[PDB]
Design a protein around this ligand. Structure first.
Ligand SMILES: [Mg+2]
Ligand SMILES: [Mg+2]
Ligand SMILES: [Mg+2]
Ligand SMILES: [Mg+2]
Ligand SMILES: [Mg+2]
Ligand SMILES: [Mg+2]
Ligand SMILES: [Mg+2]
Ligand SMILES: [Mg+2]
Ligand SMILES: [Mg+2]
Ligand SMILES: [Mg+2]
Ligand SMILES: [Mg+2]
Ligand SMILES: [Mg+2]
Ligand SMILES: [Mg+2]
Ligand SMILES: [Mg+2]
Ligand SMILES: [Mg+2]
Ligand SMILES: [Mg+2]
Ligand SMILES: [Mg+2]
Ligand SMILES: [Mg+2]
Ligand SMILES: [Mg+2]
Ligand SMILES: [Mg+2]
Ligand SMILES: [Mg+2]
Ligand SMILES: [Mg+2]
Ligand SMILES: [Mg+2]
Ligand SMILES: [Mg+2]
Ligand SMILES: [Zn+2]
Lengths: 129, 48, 79, 134, 141
RNA sequence: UCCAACGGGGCCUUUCCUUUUUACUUUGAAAAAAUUAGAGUGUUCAAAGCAGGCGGCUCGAAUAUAUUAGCAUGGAAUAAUAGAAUAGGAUGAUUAAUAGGGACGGUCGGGGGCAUCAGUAUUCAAUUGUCAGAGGUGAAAUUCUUGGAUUUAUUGAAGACUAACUACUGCGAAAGCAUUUGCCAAGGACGUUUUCAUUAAUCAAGAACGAAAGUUAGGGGAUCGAAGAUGAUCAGAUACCGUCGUAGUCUUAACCAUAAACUAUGCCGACUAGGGAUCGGGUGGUGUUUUUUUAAUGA
RNA sequence: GGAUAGUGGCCUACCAUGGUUUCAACGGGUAACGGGGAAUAAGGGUUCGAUUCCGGAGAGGGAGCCUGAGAAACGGCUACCA
């Protein structure tokens, strides 16, 4: 049964990127998915995406430009202190500024650099590079 | 190999057989298209 | 090549009801006129019951596996 | 899914699973049950006392032969007879029948060497830095 | 995704996107209410009532046409079920199987299905007790 | 007097009646000294020890460190938790998940249980015609046979079993399931603009069924047949065969719970290639076989 | 109610039948005094900590006491065992 919609969305995006598809369809949609995709967008890993409202969980169509090496979810959403953030970036990213680790904090969903700038912390959602 | 080759042979033969049957139907329909392009007692019984 | 966001209308018509971009029913409703009484009654396309004219108690359709078969002599319009 | 729970509240199942499975290791089992020294040559000790029964290769002709350097020793702890090496034929003179010898780990099958005789190191006797007390 | 079976069928009804009444529908909402009350008085269950209204009266969906679900409309008029409809049919189906097993003791197949039906009842009975739709002392036979 | 911004005060968006807390995270106290990290200092150097110098000098350890539990504090996300939520004139909330359950419609199936019908075949028995062999093997001998064997024809009885149709087709959780008809309940898929609204997945504990063989007590006992007896012990491709045949094979009521009980391969969910054959349901088109106010519906 | 410096099944009398437990009670093993700490490690972890400081407990093994503000003391007392 569907446990993590975000995992399914990110895996579908990964398979589309691997196969070279220029656009991918994600069902069901969620606020967490939209925020995560917005972070990827801001960092340029994805382009435009459009949300289709069907009076149900909804759908998303994402255009892909081939700039995404990998995107994944860290399940379970571990609690992360500010000191621990560096450790996570050491485990999930091939290099030190290559990629981002995305955290859901009291100030919203943001990459680790923004969380450090704002001095906030929370749980970890995933990574993109 | 073994029994599996024999089963492969049968399916291929059936597939080949189907192609011949279908081509016959296409040939016949073409003939019908070309055909379409180009005693008092019997008339009373023509309906039968 | 195809645009998932703006699919062709013919393409979606071929797809299953639930597999389209926004799922919706392929069924419809009908204005069926009673033969005996000439009154008009609404009948669901895939009706599961033998719809009878209220005035005359005459069967208008008979249920089937899919679309209900309208009784002989009953005229109909899509509403 | 890797065949293990990953939920954030599944610590107990992870802990109990590890404890049960740790006993599969032979090293872990021996460490906990205190049976790791059964395989030891001396049963857990680094050196073993013995009694010199005979100098078996004493009649061999070739000097400093491997056989000439073998002595049969009876372990005092359990009474098991074993063979030990002496450093050389010169050191064979200091060893005599019925004397206390200390053995240490080392003709295959000879896995011990004599380090002390009558409480005195052989090398000290060989180097003429001590006299064997009788 | 059938429970108690290996079937993977997806057959279902597809609710239309629009949540407003059809344009062609030109019957008063109140008249629809009286039809629901009459059919329930005759003894039809809410599932069967919706089929009749949709079949012969053009009622696409009671909630869409009237704004309230058939179950709420009946309770607003004093018509309520003794137990939830889905639980009612499961118990009735089990009763029929138990009656057959009484006459036929060698039907090991029917014996197997009774366990599946009964275990389905316990899962459904447990849900309603939690929601308090069903009294906590309620137990199946 | 008007328009565009920037700013203030009053109202309105209620006719009447019924009827947030936690988790998590930030920050601050606290967590003895010694120990650890760190700053200064020519113990002759070092390991160490150590806090005060000049006559106001703006000189000097500036210090830090601890997973959890308790205390105080800032938090918008995430995850649980709540509502006189969008209520009614008997009564509060949102979707209706290509999650699940239930319902309805016409189907589909060698799915199951109880009856019922048929089919030859095997064995046996009655009658019937004829006469020397029949059987079996690689070859023979027990065996049957002039009271007629084997073979022929007309029948009858018993107990099993459903050939050909039979297919890389169908059903069932698996084991398994092929004659007709009827009854009893069950079921997958499909159709649905019907219904409930999270009721779900995996599963220690705990439960039902489980080929063949086998155990207990009745019934039946045709065919085959472990065991046992007996004929022959000559010939290596036909080298273990022939006759009688106990238990068993069948069924009723309980035990046994094992198979190479196989994808030699945990389950649930999502995604990632092309192709056309088949089974079941549904939709549309078309023209052949069809056929007609009995009805009913096909290929 | 008694006893205590005092709360309290701490004990007594009379009442109820309670209390803990698969979120592991109860029982068993421990070459189990606990901690600050020590070692190793890149990080997570693993091991050691009788041993300079803090806290507990003991004075050959059980039991009971006098004095005193304070001890169930042991370089105080009395009995039993060795
Ligand atoms: Mg996977
Ligand atoms: Mg179903
Ligand atoms: Mg199946
Ligand atoms: Mg359903
Ligand atoms: Mg704390
Ligand atoms: Mg649904
Ligand atoms: Mg049905
Ligand atoms: Mg004869
Ligand atoms: Mg078939
Ligand atoms: Mg047949
Ligand atoms: Mg018997
Ligand atoms: Mg099998
Ligand atoms: Mg899968
Ligand atoms: Mg088809
Ligand atoms: Mg008492
Ligand atoms: Mg210890
Ligand atoms: Mg101890
Ligand atoms: Mg200590
Ligand atoms: Mg003391
Ligand atoms: Mg002593
Ligand atoms: Mg004093
Ligand atoms: Mg004392
Ligand atoms: Mg003393
Ligand atoms: Mg003292
Ligand atoms: Zn009429």
């Amino acid at each position: 049964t569907r446990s993590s919609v975000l995992a399914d969305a990110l895996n579908a995006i990964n398979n589309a990127e691997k196969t070279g598809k220029r656009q991918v369809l994600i069902r069901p949609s969620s606020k967490v998915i939209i925020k995560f995709l917005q972070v990827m967008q801001k960092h340029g890993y994805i382009g435009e995406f459009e949300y289709i409202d069907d009076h149900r969980s909804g759908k998303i169509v994402v255009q892909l430009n081939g700039r995404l090496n990998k995107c994944g979810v860290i399940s379970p959403r571990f609690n992360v202190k500010i000191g621990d953030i560096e450790k996570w970036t050491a485990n999930l990213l091939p290099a030190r500024q290559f990629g981002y680790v995305i955290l859901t904090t009291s100030a919203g969903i943001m990459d680790h650099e923004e969380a450090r700038r704002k001095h906030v912390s929370g749980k970890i959602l995933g990574f993109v590079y | 190999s073994g029994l599996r080759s024999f089963l492969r042979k049968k399916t291929q033969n059936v597939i080949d057989e189907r192609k011949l049957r279908v081509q016959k139907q296409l040939d016949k329909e073409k003939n019908i298209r070309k055909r379409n392009h180009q005693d008092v007692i019997e008339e009373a019984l023509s309906r039968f | 090549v195809q645009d998932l966001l703006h699919p062709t209308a013919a393409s979606e018509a071929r797809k299953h009801k639930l597999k389209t971009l926004v799922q919706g029913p392929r069924s419809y409703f009908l204005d069926v006129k009673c033969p005996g009484c000439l009154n008009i009654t609404t009948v669901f396309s895939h009706a599961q019951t033998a719809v009878t004219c209220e005035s005359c108690s005459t069967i208008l359709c008979t249920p089937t596996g899919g679309k209900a078969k309208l009784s002989e002599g009953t005229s109909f319009r899509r509403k | 899914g890797k065949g293990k729970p990953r939920g954030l509240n599944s610590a107990r199942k992870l802990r109990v699973h590890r404890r049960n499975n740790r006993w599969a290791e032979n090293n872990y089992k021996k460490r906990l049950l205190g049976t790791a020294f059964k395989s030891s040559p001396f049963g857990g000790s680094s050196h073993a006392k013995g009694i010199v029964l005979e100098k078996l290769g004493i009649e061999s002709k070739q000097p400093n032969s491997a056989i000439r350097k073998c002595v049969r020793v009876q372990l005092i702890k359990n009474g098991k007879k074993v063979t030990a090496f002496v450093p050389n034929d010169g050191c064979l003179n200091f060893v005599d029948e019925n004397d206390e010898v200390l053995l240490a780990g080392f003709i295959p099958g000879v896995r011990f060497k004599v380090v002390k005789v009558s409480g005195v190191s052989l090398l000290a006797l060989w180097k003429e830095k001590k006299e064997k007390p009788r | 995704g059938r429970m108690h079976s290996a079937g993977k069928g997806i057959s279902s009804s597809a609710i239309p996107y629009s949540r407003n009444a059809p344009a062609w529908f030109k019957l008063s909402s109140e008249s629809v209410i009286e039809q629901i009350v009459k059919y329930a008085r005759k003894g039809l269950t809410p599932s069967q009532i919706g089929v009749l209204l949709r079949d012969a009266h053009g009622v696409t969906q009671a909630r869409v046409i009237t704004g309230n679900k058939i179950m709420r409309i009946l309770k607003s008029n004093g018509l309520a079920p003794e137990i939830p409809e889905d639980l009612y049919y499961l118990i009735k189906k089990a009763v029929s199987v138990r009656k057959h097993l009484e006459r036929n003791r060698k039907d090991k197949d029917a014996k197997f299905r009774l366990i599946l039906i009964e275990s389905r009842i316990h899962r459904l009975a447990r849900y309603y007790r939690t929601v308090a739709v069903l009294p906590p002392n309620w137990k199946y036979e």
